[PDB]
Structure 1
């Protein structure tokens, strides 16, 4: 006998105040019991489970399930109740590597470590909670009682404890062989390197020898799995990656479900297929959730879908990451709050692509959305590559400078350069810092009656120009905006406007270029036509003229 090192147990507890499970065993057919008896006798021989005395008060139900197209049974232990009662664990598997962050490899070898899993012993003090009972034939004897000695399949702690145990075992091997990479997934180890094949094979044999120290054996007869790999919805190849085939179905009509699935595929595709769009399709799913409802596609959705089909007509692949090179991220505006990007190191060779959509909200502008996209890409890039890419953005340096220096919030985007690819992001208007000499001054006001919803909006000017318009089904806020709109409409290319609307100032000072409010959009359209606009605020009801006059005209 060659001594093997035991695997250290992870200590496990139930949640505070909770006892173990006490769940009734279901009746089983005579045929199933005989099957289960055989399996457990075999499992017992192998040391996975042990017969226990009558003292243990816990129980978890066991089932026998027929393996389709076979006459063979499998055991299934239903640990749902124990799982609810078991502590939370650190789950190492939460974050999966993005293929775009991987490095090219010459060789990747797969080793089956399926035998090691049932070799991971269970914390001695916890075993009692895993007790289960094989019912007896005709219920004429006590059921056969067992508990687990190893990590049970289906138990809450098994994946985290298995993974952590394998990592600790593999640690010294990885540390002392810095020229390979090792990745565990389920019951397999993946071992990659750039060594000449003879040296790579030697490393695999050395890994096998290392693993034997804990008695974990692997099959001489090599894995059926070899590059390329199907993994987590991707295809991994030695020197490129892609998403698994994306096939958009033909349909005469689309249900809610069809559309959710369609958008899901497009979202998945968008990490390597450049320019994917989902706005108009996603708009169809707004608010409603009877999955069977049939939604007529809008013309816009039909256009988006056709554009996506064209994007998807043939395979596109990404390359892997070369740490010796800079990362570059380029962004384009697509319209309707949509943005698309590519991250590459060499021209025409993307590591990945992606998209960003405008946030929900009342008003917005392209510079703010571009800024948001940059932060999103920055954070994604730190995760995947550990560094911020250099940005190529469709905004002139002078535009950005004017924006950030004058914007009421602090704002920043990291190192970037202008790329002249339309449509360019620009500032559509900029308010004056000081009142304009020689420009007509419009004193504006609006008010509405909260009961009748009638209101008025208008202005008076230093030239004696005046206007009041009667409005129906309106509110104070809308009349305040209407008054500013009237002043913009009726003035020359330069204008001073005096308002008491805190609401309107708060909107305009946010510098929107688009709004959910049609009225705000009309104001923006007017601002775009002006050469100079100075917007002055004064407090209401303070005897402040022009304002006071217009208030009287509009509050009547």
Structure 2
């Protein structure tokens, strides 16, 4: 199967990801910015107990570490969601290089109608965060047993530049693959990937190369939602069918 031939490429079998080729990211602040520290709002014991295993897994994986930071933003109960809006306001903007899905799909020619669709799991966490920038994203945590600050050692969710920074990182890591397979079409939308070939055979071995490449580089795709070598797929809210849409 596709699962057994490529255990490092699937999130279910390959372990949490780490883009080994990508240096830890530095997050430049606006010249005006000084740290913002927002008090954590209280939460029910149920919410805290629901958050706990997620925090604990991230701690065990080293994705969260203890810190002491002049920054602090609230965690909210919804699994954990961090309100980083006041950090986002203080981070310098970067040029938006991610194409909108419409333009991205315009690069899909009729000649390639065999599709594989993959979504990368915990994509942002594959990218490391430079220690100088880790204090920006600190929050307060108490196990449901004393309170302390934690922050992220990887690119975090809710950070405004995470999608663009990830898209640019993966483009660098898949550049060679594109060279080694000039007859394949590869669409990247952050963590959503579409591979297209003219034939099922080319799609089969092209998907083999892509999965091997992704796992080697330290990315992990969802085997659950993978659509592999199919004439009909869903991608970015579109149904791709008979060369349409």
CA distance in 2, matches of 1:216, 1:101: 24
The runs of at least 4 consecutive aligned structure 1 residues that moved more than 6 Å come to: none
Q: Secondary structure in 1 aligned to 2:187?
A: strand
* Superposed displacement of residue 217, structure 1: 3.1
Would you say 1:206 and 2:209 are equivalent positions?
Answer: yes
Residue 29 (structure 1) aligned to one of 36, 44, 48: 44
Residue 194 (structure 2) aligned to one of 190, 195, 198: 190
Query: Where do residues 312-391 of structure 1 align in structure 2 (5 Å cutoff)?
Result: none
CA deviation vs aligned residue, 1:218-240 (integer Å, no higher than 9, x gap): 355661585243645x5432422
* Superposed displacement of residue 188, structure 1: 2.2
Would you say 1:75 and 2:83 are equivalent positions?
Answer: no
Determine if contact 1:59/1:131 at 8 Å carries over to the other structure.
yes
CA distance in 1, matches of 2:149, 2:158: 19
Determine if contact 1:25/1:135 at 8 Å carries over to the other structure.
no
Bigger Rg, which one: 1
Determine if contact 1:228/1:238 at 8 Å carries over to the other structure.
no
Residue 59 (structure 1) aligned to one of 72, 75, 83: 72
* Superposed displacement of residue 212, structure 1: 2.1
CA distance in 2, matches of 1:239, 1:144: 54
Residue 132 (structure 1) aligned to one of 123, 128, 139: 139
| 1:135–1:115 distance in 2 versus 1, CA, 3 Å | closer
TM-score for the superposition, normalised by structure 2: 0.81
| 1:163–1:220 distance in 2 versus 1, CA, 3 Å | same
Tell me what 1:103 maps to. 109
Query: Where do residues 444-459 of structure 1 align in structure 2 (5 Å cutoff)?
Result: none
| 1:102–1:190 distance in 2 versus 1, CA, 3 Å | closer
Count of paired positions: 224
Tell me what 2:120 maps to. 113
Determine if contact 2:20/2:218 at 8 Å carries over to the other structure.
yes
Determine if contact 1:4/1:212 at 8 Å carries over to the other structure.
no
Determine if contact 2:186/2:196 at 8 Å carries over to the other structure.
yes
CA distance in 2, matches of 1:189, 1:173: 13
Q: Secondary structure in 2 aligned to 1:201?
A: helix
TM-score for the superposition, normalised by structure 1: 0.38
Residue 166 (structure 1) aligned to one of 156, 166, 170: 170
Determine if contact 1:64/1:75 at 8 Å carries over to the other structure.
yes
Would you say 1:147 and 2:151 are equivalent positions?
Answer: yes
CA deviation vs aligned residue, 1:317-351 (integer Å, no higher than 9, x gap): xxxxxxxxxxxxxxxxxxxxxxxxxxxxxxxxxxx
CA deviation vs aligned residue, 1:100-138 (integer Å, no higher than 9, x gap): 56311220101232144321112321111100002465x
Would you say 1:217 and 2:220 are equivalent positions?
Answer: yes
Q: Secondary structure in 2 aligned to 1:172?
A: helix
Structure 1 residue ranges without an equivalent (≥5)? 66-73, 242-556
| 1:201–1:82 distance in 2 versus 1, CA, 3 Å | same
Determine if contact 2:117/2:233 at 8 Å carries over to the other structure.
no
* Superposed displacement of residue 148, structure 1: 0.5
CA deviation vs aligned residue, 1:23-66 (integer Å, no higher than 9, x gap): 111011122222223221111112221122xx42220100111x
CA deviation vs aligned residue, 1:490-538 (integer Å, no higher than 9, x gap): xxxxxxxxxxxxxxxxxxxxxxxxxxxxxxxxxxxxxxxxxxxxxxxxx
Would you say 1:38 and 2:53 are equivalent positions?
Answer: yes
CA distance in 1, matches of 2:105, 2:123: 27
CA distance in 2, matches of 1:199, 1:180: 8
Tell me what 1:18 maps to. 33
CA distance in 2, matches of 1:116, 1:201: 24
CA deviation vs aligned residue, 1:260-302 (integer Å, no higher than 9, x gap): xxxxxxxxxxxxxxxxxxxxxxxxxxxxxxxxxxxxxxxxxxx
| 1:86–1:191 distance in 2 versus 1, CA, 3 Å | same
| 1:230–1:198 distance in 2 versus 1, CA, 3 Å | closer
| 1:222–1:130 distance in 2 versus 1, CA, 3 Å | closer
Residue 129 (structure 2) aligned to one of 103, 122, 126: 122
Q: Secondary structure in 1 aligned to 2:43?
A: coil
CA distance in 1, matches of 2:219, 2:242: 28
CA deviation vs aligned residue, 1:409-437 (integer Å, no higher than 9, x gap): xxxxxxxxxxxxxxxxxxxxxxxxxxxxx
CA distance in 1, matches of 2:242, 2:148: 51
Query: Where do residues 292-307 of structure 1 align in structure 2 (5 Å cutoff)?
Result: none
